[PDB]
Design an enzyme around this catalytic site. Sequence first.
Site, PDB file in Angstrom:
ATOM      1  CG  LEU A  85      -2.208  -0.660   1.153  1.00 44.14           C
ATOM      2  CD1 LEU A  85      -3.179  -0.218   0.066  1.00 44.14           C
ATOM      3  CD2 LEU A  85      -2.083  -2.101   0.810  1.00 44.14           C
ATOM      4  CG  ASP A  86       1.436   3.596  -3.173  1.00 45.07           C
ATOM      5  OD1 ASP A  86       2.586   2.934  -3.019  1.00 45.07           O
ATOM      6  OD2 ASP A  86       0.929   3.760  -4.383  1.00 45.07           O
TER       7      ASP A  86
END
Lengths: 134, 161, 49, 108, 98, 446, 108, 288, 151, 49, 85
Positions: free
Chosen positions: K39-40
């Site tokens: 996940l960013d």
Amino acid sequence: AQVPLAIVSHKRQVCSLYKRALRNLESWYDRRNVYRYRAVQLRARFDENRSKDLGEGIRLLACGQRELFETRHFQPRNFANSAGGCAFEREVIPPDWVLDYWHPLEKAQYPEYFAKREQRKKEFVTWWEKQYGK
Amino acid sequence: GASETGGVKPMVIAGRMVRERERLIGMSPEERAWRKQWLKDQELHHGPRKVPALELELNNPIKRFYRAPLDKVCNVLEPVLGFQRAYTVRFWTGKALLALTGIYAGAYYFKYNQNDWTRKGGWRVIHSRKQCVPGDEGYPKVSDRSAPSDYAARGFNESPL
Amino acid sequence: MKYLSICSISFVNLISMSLSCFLLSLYFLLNDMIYFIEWELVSLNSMSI
Amino acid sequence: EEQEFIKRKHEATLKLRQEFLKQSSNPYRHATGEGGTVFDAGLARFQAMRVSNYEHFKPTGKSFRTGLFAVVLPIALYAWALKAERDGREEKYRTGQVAYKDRQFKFI
Amino acid sequence: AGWNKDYKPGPYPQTEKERLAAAKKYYLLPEEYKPYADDGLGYGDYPKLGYGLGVEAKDSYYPWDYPEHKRNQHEPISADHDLYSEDRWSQAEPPRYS
Amino acid sequence: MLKIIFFLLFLIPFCFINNMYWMVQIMMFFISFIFLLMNNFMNYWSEISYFLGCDMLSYGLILLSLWICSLMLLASEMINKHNNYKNLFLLNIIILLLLLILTFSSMSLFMFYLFFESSLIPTLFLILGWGYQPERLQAGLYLLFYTLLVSLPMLIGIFYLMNKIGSMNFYLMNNFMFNYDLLYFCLLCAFLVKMPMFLVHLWLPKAHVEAPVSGSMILAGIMLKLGGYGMLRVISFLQLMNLKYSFVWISISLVGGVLVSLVCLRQTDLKALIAYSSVAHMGIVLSGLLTMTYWGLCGSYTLMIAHGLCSSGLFCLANVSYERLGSRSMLINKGLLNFMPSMTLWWFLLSSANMAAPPTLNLLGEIYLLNSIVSWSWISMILLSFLSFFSAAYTLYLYSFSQHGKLFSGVYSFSSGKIREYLLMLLHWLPLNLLILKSESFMLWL
Amino acid sequence: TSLTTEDFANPSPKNWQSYGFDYKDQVEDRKATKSTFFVTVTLCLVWGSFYWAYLPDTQFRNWAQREGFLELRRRELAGVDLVSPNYVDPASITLPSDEDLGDTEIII
Amino acid sequence: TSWLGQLMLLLSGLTMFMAGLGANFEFDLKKIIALSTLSQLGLMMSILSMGFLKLAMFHLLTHALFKALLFMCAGAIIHNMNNSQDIRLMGGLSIHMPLTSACFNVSNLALCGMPFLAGFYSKDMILEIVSISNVNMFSFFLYYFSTGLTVSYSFRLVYYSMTGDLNCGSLNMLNDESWIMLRGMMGLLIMSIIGGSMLNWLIFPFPYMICLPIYMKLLTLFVCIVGGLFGYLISLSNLFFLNKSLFMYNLSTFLGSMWFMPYISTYGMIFYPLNYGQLVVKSFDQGW
Amino acid sequence: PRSPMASFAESVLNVIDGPITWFRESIVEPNQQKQNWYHQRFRRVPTIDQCYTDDAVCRFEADQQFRRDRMVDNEIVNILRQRFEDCTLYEAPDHMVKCRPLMDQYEKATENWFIKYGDLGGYANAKTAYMKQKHRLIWERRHGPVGSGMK
Amino acid sequence: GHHQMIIKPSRFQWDKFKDLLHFYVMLGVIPVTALVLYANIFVGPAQLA
Amino acid sequence: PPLSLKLINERVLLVLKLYDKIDPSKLNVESHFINDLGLDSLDHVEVIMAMEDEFGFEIPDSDAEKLLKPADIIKYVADKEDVYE
């Protein structure tokens, strides 16, 4: 526990601005179908800047923040049950030590409850002494 | 000596976790256990007990008699309808009786002790002229008060002096 | 009171008082009455509070 | 750079927080029944400062200019207005201009 | 507990050695400390704090010692806190327009 | 009238017998009841006894003192709890009360002055003896030296009046009207100080903040009235001179009332705020008094009675809070509705009375001074509107801020309100309302 | 100690809570409370206010109102102005003629 | 009879006009009803300034009847939501809250002016008397424009609450089984259907006569029709519409803040008196 | 009782009146005693003009007499106000024609009241009121009636 | 049953005070009512002669 | 009514599963967002926004940095609602 440290990374300033930007977006376009449409586009504008130098990014936040403030809603949404909400902390609960000043006859209406509290008081002191060195 | 707290040594037991923020930021395992215990104690599995002592310590003798009679009809009817239903009849048979006697005293006062010319205090009534309409007695009716002495007589016209 | 909700006690008083006032308002409409009762506190300089 | 300074204050305030909890929930001080508050220098300094200001007062011109327009002229200008208006109104009465029919506030 | 005479502000600080003790005396690191201008109406060596958007603009979610004042344990109090308090002339966010 | 005096004198020995603290107030309350029966007074003096009379003006002020001085004993139960020279403390009040009774019951102007100031010294002992904070010195002198500095010149003005009138008796003085400019300033600048006027009030915030609870009662209760009562007797023969310089006093008090109300809003101390509230209302009392009209005179007499009971009342509540929280600052005292909810009711009623809320006797007097001032000059409507507006601005701030918010965090456990405190508050407020029924008596002193 | 479920349910008539009038002698504390209530309330407020209400007409205000009616009827019948504008009749007065005044200030 | 009638009419007209527009931008359920109350108060103050008592008195009693009912409905709605007054969270209550929504619909229509409800008897006669007397041109427009605005926000509230698709949170306490709350409401609800006609036969011993051309007597209904459609229709939205409120940002903020009155009276004023308190005490009570 | 409610109205008025009249006639009135109370009469006393400038009892005599007459004169105005008060309530809606004479009586009384006790304020006494009259009369013969100004 | 102890300050002192005041005010009301009832019913008012 | 801890575990995972940029298999109580699930940061922001709406409150931006796995989010909501069962 952990007390937050005031210093905030540039990465975090972008994060916060993104959160504020989206929440402001909801207020303007309440409806979910519209909101999800526009929120997606908003995320696009960030990805078209994700590949940039920080110093360039410093210029981005400045205009990014100002336009947000320049486009703040006149009645932003909050959550009624949380800080800033219309219904936040309506009730106030006195400190525990109030109970101990009840008239002894008053205590007789909940003899079990006051029986327990005085067992807890014995435990609390030993707990407090260890925690803070007495 | 006079112990306000009655012996029970006053303290603060809940600790940090009362305040919401102080909970979110972090809680050691002992604190979490303590917090869980505190909430479990606040549950009460019975209603308040009925202490005979209060009911005399918070009822003066005058009140215990002033109400004595109508509490006999509460005692008479409480096995006929249940304590809740009967007591409501005791409350409304009594509180309403005061109203009925309240009007009569008020009605009496405004009929004989109304303010007159020999006092300044007291309630003073100046009623207007009723709407006389056709069919009523003597339709072409006129205000009998013509001379200035007629107005605001306050019973002075019929004084002996 | 100790066994009756103050809301339950309160409601019957106001409604009965409201209902009675409603009957009077009808009576005053029919006769077009105007009653002006007043109690006096103090007077001076040909005046009266 | 300045980042350390933010960290200097953080751990500095952090010791204060720990000390506050010790006094805050002190069973033995709650145990007195004496009532009162945790001793706080911040409130104490503020309360004391609020009382004493002459010590640091000086007729510096700014203070005079502040005090001058603050009360003295509002008093002077308005005291002048009262004297002016009453003198004009008084002059009519002394001259006999207003018939007793037209005198306002007969009963005052 | 002490008394007011034991806590009233000292005379305006004139020297760096005096500034550092003054900053110490108010539990402030030597960079925050900033006495009033001492035009002649000054509050002595008392710090100058706040005067911004007001108390209500302080972070609400921080775990304050005194949440009610939004203040910490020994932290000083602005001389005009009674004016920039949460119910007095303060705002959560900068006003939209001038 | 001697019935009262000799009753008090023979109650002096009760100070010496031990375990007689509570038997004193009953003798002090009972005498109020006895005094309460002998109301058959008129504008002119009545019940002469060797130099002691009483008219409707003096009666209400005397009866106010007996009530207030009786409540002092209830309020200052802590002196009994710690046996802190209680016997001496009792003797101070019994002496002090006697000086007041003589001051109002004196028929000659010289006597009024003789007991006018003499009451001060029993007050001065009260502040130093039983005051907590170190500043009772620096506030002990202000009370003594502002008063003495302006009362000593008044003594000359009194004697200069014998050589013209030939006597001190008030009725004989009213037959004269004097034209000397300085004499006007030697019989009113001495009372304008004790009212107090806005610019010479610097002693009032210091004396009240530092004095004990009982000293706060009498200082706010009867001392501010001796200035007011004195004026009502000596503007009778200064009518001509009053017209040349009244506009100076009216402007100062009116503008003084407004400016002090703003000062009230920027206070942070309960005792200070209540004390500054005294200057605000006393500005209206003095303003209407110098208008000299029938309304301004009757109204001023009324408001002095009402305000004393209220401001004395509000000093009870500050003491109650201070006794437990230990600090008199507003920041410490918050949300008391959540500690002592029963107490908060009395906070409101006494607070509401201070802002001229109905049906209190305070609103009756304030309606009248307002009438006289307006009749005096329509320009007075400007601040008289501001002053009445701001006179509620700080009262709400006093009540709301101290009762409403979330509770203080550092406060340690303390007792709840006791029956004594509630009974004390009732006796303050409850007469302040019922008196409206018989304002007939405590209004028409002219 | 380690009080039980019945030490809170069986109130001990040994310790007592004070009504604010004394903290050492229980009977004294009740004794002062009772007597203080009686005089302050049962006498000063109840008997006092009652007696006030039936106080005789001492200001002659009720008496006036009786005059205001009788005095008005007699003079409304007598052809005289209802309120006389003269404290004493003007003709009874003896004005100092103009030469006597000698520029004395006359005011209205 | 005096110049005050000129002034009161102007000030009242703005009050009813301003909140009429303000109600179309506010998003708090509790506030929209408040501005609704205030908007109709200006209506009384204006007709009262014409010189009519029964008309003002008649509408006043009418306003109390249904306006109290509306707040009762709001309280039930809000308490079932998570204590949130915002209308953007609510939606689709016409089926999740049968009884309460029905209780609201009668009250809202009474405000709208559906013929022969409580509000109609008062609003109608008032508007008719306005068109019969000698009015100001500006006042006349505000009178009828507000009625359009009065219906505008009211159905705008219908869309965001009943007809609109649900927009609440995942956990919703939607329920309409609070009989204790409801029984009290039906007391008002009955009156809101008969309060109008009942008082017409009682308040007016001498009924007012009116005879106006059709093209003004029907103006009250016609504007209500336009307002109801305009408020409802504009409330709708899609993916490719224009946020007209956002676009004219300055104007919306002006009308959405009640012409900045809260700011003027709370943040544009209190700064000055409170500073003066410091300068006085700073320079006199401890200075000069 | 041509109206339905008025027929019901009178029914209640019988219920509230019936007992009280009986109670008044049954208990209160029959058991009371006969006793008469009188009305104070004050012999007129010499006016302040006869008083010497050195005696205080004679001044005190007149000052009290002046004050009593003030009350009688304060409220003879009050009675006249109540007449115009009552006519406006007993003659509306056509009350302007009938109250107009009563108000004329009222306004005249106020002026005579204000010519006599007016503008004295508190501390007004027999001496002050009489001295206003002396100054007023002097101005009248010299400058004519007030309101015309001086010459 | 199932109720939660909600902590509130003691009301006993206030409850006691309301009782004591009510007792002692009554302790005076019955006498004065007897007197005023005795005076008005048996002695009665005078007649303006 | 009381919010049981088990439900919090269900409610959190339901939202995450509905999130289309996550793996329903890897998704578990212990997984990390930026480390395991890729996940960013911006993606992690959107997840918190769902969590806020899921339970109805604000998760402060300062305190969102402690929420690096659904167990922490589960603990957080439990602490706020003080349901320790």
